[PDB]
Write a protein that binds this ligand. Structure first.
Ligand code: EUJ
Ligand code: EUJ
Ligand code: EUJ
Ligand code: EUJ
Ligand code: D10
Ligand code: D10
Lengths: 460, 460, 460, 460
C-alpha cells in the first residue's frame, strides 16, 4: 500500500521511467535551463564590458586632461607638497575645463545649474572647506578650534577669472573640491550593433587635507549617468524575447520543483503517521530541488532587473550581476546530481559528502588560532608592514601565506626595517615562521588525512 | 598451434629475442629516432631564435624612431589625449620616416608602390578613416550617423609637405594609420655561419579612436617578409642531408610499426574466429606503436615544412614548430615503454595508469563547479578586477589560485575598491575564500587520496 | 575517601556541575575576558593607526620638501655621484628649511637650542665628519690615515649665508648630516574625537660616504616626540574605565586559575603520598590554566603600559603592542579547550597533539640539512644573488622556496649572471634544484605521512 | 674468535664505550670540526661581503658617471637608436673620463700604458671594430662582405681632442669599445679593522652592433684587480692561526676516519675468507666516514686557497667559496648520524632512506615527460614567450610551475599575444593546462604516496 509508493519516491530517474513510463520533463527542462541561463549571462557580460570600458577610458582621459603632471600608475601617490603646487594644480584643472572644446579628442557638452553645488548658469564649482575658527600655534603648543566646517565656493560659467583670485586658508583647510559635469555620446555602441546612449559624467577632483600632514593627495573620480538619447538616428527586439523565454523556463522549473517538494512533504507526513502505529523525516527532502528553486528565484529576479537596466530605467548593475552570477553558479553546481546516478562518479561525490562534516569541524578548530594570529599581527606589525594595516588585509596576507604565496616579499618588508627596531624584527621572525610552519606542516596535512580517511571509508 | 603464437605475440623484447633470436631492429631504430629528432629540433630552434631576435630588435628600434616620446615598457599605455598631441605624433612619425637615412643606426631602403594603400611611386601612406555622415550633438542628446566608413589617405614619396596640411575630422574619426615598408639585410646571420637574407618590414602605426572615449591609443606593428638576397657575396649543404636522414628514419619506423599493428590485427581476427568454436579484442593493439606512428607522421610532415621554410618557399613557422615540438614530445614520452620492462619502474607506471580513470572522472566532477565559479566571477568582478575581464583570463586566475599563485594581489585589487562598493567587496571576499578553501582543502586532497589508493592497490 | 576526590578533579565542567552543582564562574569569566581583551586590542590598534599614518605622511612630505630631485619609490637608490650634486642637495635642504613657512602646506614651528648638535639659538645643524689625518695617494699606492673622526658643524638660525661657504673634505669625508626639529599640531586627531597632541619631529638628513665608493647615498629619517599640548581648546573618560575593567577581569581570572593550580598541586602531593603506601605527577597540572595565567599577566602588564602611553608618560609602543597582541593570541588559542569537550572536535585536536612530538623530531632532523644549505648558499651565491646577501635573507629565501614562492625569480637572477661565471651558474643550478626537490618531494611528504599516521591511530 | 670482533665493529658509540671503555675521540673531534668549520665560513663570508659591496658600489658610480642619461634599473634596456645619440654617448664618456678628478666623489688615479689596447702613455682606448670590406645595398638586395674584422682605435692621454674627430663606419660597424683603468684605495676596510688594499678597476664600455638591428645596446663592465698597498700607514695575525687550527682539525679527522675505513676493509676481507670455509661486503663500509673524509679534503683545500686569497696571491674566490660551502654543507648533514642513534629520530631517517630508491626511480620516469615538455615549449613558445627563450629558462619556468609559482604571469604573457596568432594561443592553453594538471594532480601525489608507503613499512 505505502511501501510501493515510498520505493517509487526514492528511485532514480531511469528506474522511475521503467516503473511508470512517465515523461522525464524536469530533466530536459533543467538541461534547457542551464543552456539559456548561461547564454543570458554571457550576453549580459559582453554588453556590460563595453560600458565599463567606455567609462574607464573616459576617466583616464579626464585624469590626463585635468591633473597637472599626471602619469599612468601614479594614482596612489599623486599629491601636492607646496602651496605653489596646489595653486598650480587647481588653476590648471579650471583652465583645462575652460579650454576643453578646443583641446580634447573627445566631444563633450557642458552642463549648467541643476542644484548644488552649482548655481544657475554655472558649470564648474570650485569649493574650499575649512574650519569655522582655527588658531594653530605650534610654537606655543596652543590651539583654538571650532570643528564646524565652512564651505566657500566659486562658480565658473563655461564659455560659448574670478577663480584666479582664490585664496586658500592653508592652516584651517579641510579640503578643496572641483565639481563639473560633461555630456557625451557613446558612439562605440555601434560596434556591438546597439544604439548609442547619452552619458553624463559627474567629475569630482579632490585635494584632500584632512590629515593635515603637509601632504595633500589629489584624486579624480567620475560617476556616469546613462540615458537614452532623445534624438537617435542610425542609417539602417530579440534580446527582450530571450529574457522572457528565460523567465518562463525558470517559472516552469520552479513550479515542477515546488510540486515535487510538496509531494515529498505529504509522503513524509504519511510516513510519520503510519510509524505512529527530525533527521529521518528530512530525508524526504530533495536538496537538489531546494537548490533548483533558489536558482529559479534568483534568475527570475535578476532577469527582471536586467530588463529594467537595459531599458535605462534602472542603474543597479551590481545587484543584478550578483543575482545572475549566483544563479548561474548554482545551476552549474546542480549538474553534480546527474553524475551521482553513475557509480564511478558517485563514489567521489560521496567521498566529498562524508568528509565535509569533519572538514567543517576542523575549520572551526583552526579558525580560533587563525584569528588570534590575525589580531596579534595587526597590532604588532601594522605600524611597520604595509600588508598588515587593516584586519581584512592581515587575513588576506595570512591566507595567502597558508597557500605559499607572497612569502618572500612579506619577509623582505620586515628585513627593510630590521635596523630600526630589533625587537619587532625578532618578533616578526618568530610570528611568521611559527604561523607558516604550523599551518602548512600540520593543518593542511590533517585536511589531507580527513579526505583520505573518508575516501577509504567510501571504498569499503 | 595458436597458443604458442599468441604467447610469442605478448612477450617482452628480451624474451622474444630468447624465443626466436630475431634482430631487435625496431628498438635501436627508436633510439636513433629519438636522437635525430631531438637534434633536428635543437638545430631548428637555434636557427629560429636568431630570426626572432632580429625582428624584435628592429621593431623596438622602429618604436623608438617613429613614436614621439616613446619609452620602453609604455606599450600598453602609450596614447594621445589632446588634438595637439595627436598632430605632433603623426607629423613626427612622417618626419622621421623622411629623415631615416641620415639618423638611423640601421641601413634601410625605401619601397615604393606595390598595391594598396600605396599609389605608384609612394613610400608612405597616411590614411584617416571616419564615418561617412557624422553629426554628434551631446548638448541636445542628438546624433545622426551613417556608419559607412570613408578612407581619405595622403601619399608621401621618400626623398632621393602636403601631409603637413592634414586636417582630422575629430568628431567622426574612426582611426588614423601610417603604412610604409623598409628593406634591410640581416648581416648578423654571419654569426651562425649562414648567408644573410633580405627582410622587408611592413610597418603599421595605428592611432585608434574606435572607442571614442577621448583617449586614442598609439601602437606600432611590423610584419617581416623574408627572401633570399639576389646578389649574395661572402668571402669564403649538411642541413638538408640531416633532414633527409630524419625523414628516412621516420619512414622506416612507420613501416615497421604499421607491419606490427597489421600482424596484431590479424592475430586478433584469428583469436575471435577460434573463440567462436571489444575491450578484449583491443587488447591486441599496442598503444605505444599507435603513438610511434603518430609521431612519425608528425615528424615527416614537420620536416617537409621545415625544408620548405629554410629554402624561403614557406613562411608558416608556427605550424612547423607545433608539428616538430609535438613529435619530439611524443618520442620522449615513448621512452616510458622501455622502463615498463623493469619491475620497479613498472610499479610506478602501473600506479599512474590505474589511477588515471578515476582522476579523469573526478576532473569531470570538479569541472562543473569550476565553470560555475568562472561564470560568476566574470559577471560580478569583471567590471572591477583586471584579472576577471575575460572568461579565459578568469579561468587562468582561478587555476593559478588553485595552485597557490598570485593570491594576495587578487585580494589587494579588490581591497583597492572596498570603499566604492561594499556589497561587491563582501561578495568578492565570500567568492575568493570559498573557492580557494574548497579547491585546496578538499579537491586536491581527493586527488592525493585517489593516487594513494591506486598505489596501495598496485603494491598488493 | 580519595578516589572520589581524584575523580571529581579530573572531570569536565558539565559533569562537574552535575556532580556538585557549583557555579561555573571561571568559564563565563573566560568568555568575558576574551571579549574585553579583543575589544581593547581593537581600540588600541585603531588609535595607533592614526598616529602611524600622521608620522608617515609628515615624513613623506619632508622627503619631498628637503631632498632635491626626490620621487616616490627612490628611497633605496637615492644618491649623489658628483661633487656638484652633493653641494646642490645640501644647499637645497638648507634653503628649503629656511623657506618652509612660506612654501609648506603644513604648519610647522622652529625649535632652537636644546643641547647638541645645536648651539643656543640655532635651529639647523649642518655637520661634516672626516678623518683627523687623511692622505690618500692611489697613484703611488700610498696612504697615511689617522682613523679618529673630526666633526665640524655649522649652525643656522631660522628667520623671523655662512652655510653657503661650506667646503667639503671629499677625500677624507666620512659623512654629512643635517639636523633640525619641527613642531606641529596633529589636528586630524579630531577625526577620532580625541584632543590634538603636539608633535616634535626630529629630522636627520644623512649623506653617507662610509663606503668611499664614489656613490654617496642620501636618506631622511624622522623621530616623533609626542606631548600633550599645553593650551588645548576644542569647541564642545570612558577609555581608562575600560582599561580598569580589563585589569580587574584579568586579575580575577588569574586568582581563580592560581587557586585551581594550587589545588591540583595539593592533590598531586596527596596522591604521591598515598602511592607510597615525574610524567605521572605532572598529569595533575592543567596546561590550559598555565596558559590562562600567562595571558592574564601579559594583559595586565600591557594594559598598565597602555594607560601610561595614552597619558603620554610613556613612548614604548612596541613592547606594549607585543604584550597585548601575544595575550590576545593566547586567549583566542584557549578557545580550543572548550572544543575538546565535544567528541568530534576532540578527535581532531587529539590527532594534532599526538602528531606533535614526531613533527618536532622531524623538524630537528630537517634543521641540520636546512642550515647546511643556508651556509653554503650564503657563501657561494651571496656575491652574485641579491636574495643571498645575509644569512637571515638566505633562510627567508629557502623557506619561501620550500613553499613554492618566488622560485622563478630566484632562478632568473642567476640566469642574468650565467655568462659571467659558468661554474657558479652550474653550482646554482645543482644547489637550487637539489634543495627544492629534496624538500618538496620528500620532507613535506613525510610531514603529511606523520599527520596521517597520527590520525589513523586516533581513529582506532 | 671472529663473531665477537664483528659484533664490536657494528656497534653504536655508547655500547662500544661500554664494551671496551675506549675514548670516543672521533665524536668530540667531529663536534669541534663542525664548530670551527662553521666559524671559518662565517668569517670568510663576512670578509667577502665588504669587497663585493665595494666593487658593486664603484661600478654603479661608474655607470652614473660615464653613461649619458643612465638611471638605475635601465641596465637591460639602455641603448642608442640614432647616430647622434651614439656620438653623444661616446663623447660624454670620454669627457667624463677627462673631467673625473674635479667631478667624482671618489678618489681615482689614472693608469697609463701596460699592454694592449693601450699604447705607452695612453690612459683611454676608444676602439671601433668593423668589417674589412662591407657593401650593403638593401635597395638592390645586394651585399659584398669580407667578414674579417678590422680594429681602429684612438688613444687618449689623461691630463695632468683627436677623439672628437671620430667617424663611425655605421653600415659595417661591429662594435665600439672604451677601455680604461682607475686606481683607488679601499678605505672602508678600516670598518672591519683590516688594512686598506689597492684596487685597480678595468672599465670596459661597449656599444654593441653585432645584431645590426638598428638598436645598439650600451653596457659598462668592470674587473677589479686587488693588491696590497705598497705604503700602508694606519695610526695604531689571529686569522691565519685559525686557518691552521682548521687544517689540523681536518687532518686529524681525515686520519682517524681513514684508519676506521681501513679496519673495516680488513674485517671485510677476513669475513669473506672465513665465509669461503658485493652488496653484502660493502655493508662493512661506513658511509658517514666516506662523507667525513670528503668534507675534510674539501675543507683543507678550501682553507689553503683561502690563505692564498687573503694574502692577495690568489684571486679564485669562486672556487674557494664553493669548496668551503660544500664542506660546511657536508659537515652539517653529518649531524644526522648522531640522531640515528636514537630510536624516535631513527624512525624518520630510516623512512627517508627506504623511500629514496623508489623516489629516484619515479624521478627517472618523470624526467622523460618533463624533457619532452621542455623541448616542445622551447620550440613552440620561444618565439612568443620571454620565459621560453632558452632551454634552461624553459626548465626553470616548468619547474616553478610544478610548485605553483609564477603561473598567472605565464598565462598572461600568452594572453598578450592571443590576437596575433590564435593557433599558438590555443596550443599554449593546452600545453600549460595539461602540464600543470598532470604534474600537480598525479606526480606530486605519487611522491606523497611513496613516502607514506615507506613510512608505513618502517612503522611495522
Ligand atoms: C490535474 C493536474 C494538476 C497539476 C498541474 C501541474 C502538473 C505538472 O506540473 O505535472 C508535471 C509533470 C511532469 O513532471 P516531471 O518532473 O517531468 O515528472 C514527475 C517526476 O518524475 C516526479 O519525480 P521527482 O522529480 O524525482 O520528484 C515523479 O514522482 C512524478 O510521478 P508521480 O506523479 O506518479 O508521482 C513525475 O510525474 O507533468 C507535466 O509536466 C504535464 C504536462 C502537461 C502538458 C503540457 C503542454 C503540452
Ligand atoms: C618477404 C618480406 C616481406 C616484408 C618486408 C618488410 C620486412 C620488415 O620490415 O621486417 C622487419 C624486421 C625487423 O622488425 P623488428 O621490429 O626489429 O622485429 C619484429 C618485432 O620484434 C615483432 O614484435 P613487435 O615489435 O613487438 O611487434 C616480432 O613479432 C617480429 O617477429 P615475427 O616476424 O616472427 O612475428 C620481429 O621480426 O626485419 C627487417 O627489418 C628486415 C631487414 C632486411 C635487411 C635490411 C637491409 C640490410
Ligand atoms: C573561604 C574562601 C577562601 C577562598 C576565597 C576565594 C574563593 C574563590 O575564588 O572561589 C572561586 C569559586 C568559583 O570558581 P570556579 O572556577 O567557577 O569553580 C571551581 C572550579 O570549577 C574547580 O574546577 P577547575 O576549574 O577545573 O579547577 C572546582 O574544583 C571547584 O570546586 P571545589 O571547590 O569543590 O574543588 C569549583 O569551585 O567561587 C567563587 O568565585 C566565589 C564567589 C563569591 C562571591 C562573589 C561576589 C558575589
Ligand atoms: C701504535 C699506534 C699506531 C697507530 C697510530 C694512530 C692511532 C690513532 O689514530 O688512534 C685513534 C684512537 C682514537 O680513535 P677513536 O675514533 O676515538 O676510537 C676508535 C673508534 O671508536 C673505532 O670505531 P669507529 O669509529 O666506529 O670505526 C673503534 O673500532 C676503535 O677501537 P679498536 O681500536 O679496538 O678497534 C676506537 O679506538 O686513539 C687515539 O686517538 C690515540 C691518541 C694518542 C694520544 C694523543 C696525544 C695526547
Ligand atoms: C538528496 C539531497 C542531498 C544534498 C543535495 C544538495 C547538495 C548541494 C551542494 C551545494
Ligand atoms: C600496451 C598499451 C598500453 C598503452 C600505451 C600507450 C600510452 C601512451 C601515453 C600517452
Amino acid at each position: 500500500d505505502l511501501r510501493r509508493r515510498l520505493k517509487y519516491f526514492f528511485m532514480s530517474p531511469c528506474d522511475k521511467f521503467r516503473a511508470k513510463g512517465r515523461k522525464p520533463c524536469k530533466l530536459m527542462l533543467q538541461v534547457v535551463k542551464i543552456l539559456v541561463v548561461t547564454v543570458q549571462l554571457i550576453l549580459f557580460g559582453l554588453s556590460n564590458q563595453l560600458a565599463v570600458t567606455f567609462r574607464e577610458e573616459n576617466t583616464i582621459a579626464f585624469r590626463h586632461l585635468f591633473l597637472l603632471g599626471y602619469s599612468d600608475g601614479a594614482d596612489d601617490t599623486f599629491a601636492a607638497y607646496t602651496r605653489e603646487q596646489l595653486y598650480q594644480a587647481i588653476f590648471h584643472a579650471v583652465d583645462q575645463y575652460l579650454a576643453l572644446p578646443d583641446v580634447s579628442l573627445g566631444r563633450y557638452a557642458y552642463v549648467r545649474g541643476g542644484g548644488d553645488p552649482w548655481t544657475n548658469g554655472s558649470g564648474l564649482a570650485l569649493c574650499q572647506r575649512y574650519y569655522h575658527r582655527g588658531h594653530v600655534d605650534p610654537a606655543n603648543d596652543t590651539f583654538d578650534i571650532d570643528p564646524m566646517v565652512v564651505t566657500d565656493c566659486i562658480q565658473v560659467d563655461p564659455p560659448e577669472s574670478s577663480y584666479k583670485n582664490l585664496t586658500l586658508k592653508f592652516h584651517k583647510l579641510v579640503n578643496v573640491t572641483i565639481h563639473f559635469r560633461l555630456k557625451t555620446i557613446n558612439l562605440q555602441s555601434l560596434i556591438n550593433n546597439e544604439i548609442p546612449d547619452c552619458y553624463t559624467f559627474s567629475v569630482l577632483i579632490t585635494f584632500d587635507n584632512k590629515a593635515h600632514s603637509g601632504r595633500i593627495p589629489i584624486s579624480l573620480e567620475t560617476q556616469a549617468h546613462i540615458q537614452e538619447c532623445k534624438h537617435p538616428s542610425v542609417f539602417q527586439s530579440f534580446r527582450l524575447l530571450f529574457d522572457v523565454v528565460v523567465i518562463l523556463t525558470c517559472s516552469l522549473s520552479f513550479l515542477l520543483c515546488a510540486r515535487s517538494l510538496l509531494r515529498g512533504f505529504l509522503l513524509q507526513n504519511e510516513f510519520v503517521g503510519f510509524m505512529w502505529r527530525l533527521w529521518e523525516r528530512l530525508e524526504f527532502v530533495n536538496g537538489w530541488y531546494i537548490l533548483l528553486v533558489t536558482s529559479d528565484v534568483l534568475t527570475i529576479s535578476g532577469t527582471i532587473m536586467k530588463i529594467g537596466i537595459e531599458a535605462k530605467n534602472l542603474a543597479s548593475y551590481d545587484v543584478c550581476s550578483i543575482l545572475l552570477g549566483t544563479s548561474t553558479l548554482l545551476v552549474w553546481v546542480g549538474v553534480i546530481r546527474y553524475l551521482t546516478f553513475f557509480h564511478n562518479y558517485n563514489i567521489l561525490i560521496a567521498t566529498l559528502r562524508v568528509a565535509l562534516p569533519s572538514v567543517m569541524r576542523f575549520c572551526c578548530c583552526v579558525a580560533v588560532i587563525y584569528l588570534g594570529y590575525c589580531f596579534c599581527g595587526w597590532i604588532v606589525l601594522g605600524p611597520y608592514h604595509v600588508k598588515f594595516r587593516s584586519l581584512s588585509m592581515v587575513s588576506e596576507c595570512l591566507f595567502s601565506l597558508i597557500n605559499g604565496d607572497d612569502m618572500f616579499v612579506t619577509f623582505a618588508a620586515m628585513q627593510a626595517q630590521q635596523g630600526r627596531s630589533s625587537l619587532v624584527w625578532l618578533f616578526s621572525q618568530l610570528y611568521l615562521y611559527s604561523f607558516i610552519s604550523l599551518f602548512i606542516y600540520m593543518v593542511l596535512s590533517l585536511f589531507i588525512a580527513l579526505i583520505t580517511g573518508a575516501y577509504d571509508t567510501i571504498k569499503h
